[PDB]
């Protein structure tokens, strides 16, 4: 049950999750592949911002889906 992640830059990543997992948990594994937490990054599917109140099967997120990684609060 792998999920692919696409950043706005085009960075293709890969994570292991379950259709019963929480949105926050699935976002949390982004730290284990990159290092950036779920407060600096957000989540989007089908033009809708996802949130930590539902699961993957509740959003209809299948395997081989490309998630959308957006940056919150520009800084340097």
Sketch the domain layout of the chain as residue ranges.
1-76
Say if CB 42 and CB 8 are below 8 A apart: no
23 φ, ψ (degrees, to nearest 5): -55, -45
- CA 21-36-76 angle, to 5 degrees, is 150
The verdict on domain 1-76 having CATH code 3.10.20.90 is yes
Interatomic CA distance for residues 76 and 60, integer angstroms:
36
SS3 state of residue 43: coil
CB atoms within 10 A of CB 1: 12
Interatomic CA distance for residues 31 and 13, integer angstroms:
12
């Amino acid at each position: 049950m792998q999920i692919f992640v696409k950043t706005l830059t085009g960075k293709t990543i890969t994570l292991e999750v379950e259709p019963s997992d929480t949105i926050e948990n699935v976002k949390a594994k982004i730290q284990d592949k990159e290092g950036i937490p779920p407060d600096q990054n957000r989540l989007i599917f089908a033009g809708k911002q996802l949130e930590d109140g539902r699961t993957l099967s509740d959003y209809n997120i299948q395997k081989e889906s490309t998630l959308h990684l957006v940056l919150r609060l520009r800084g340097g």
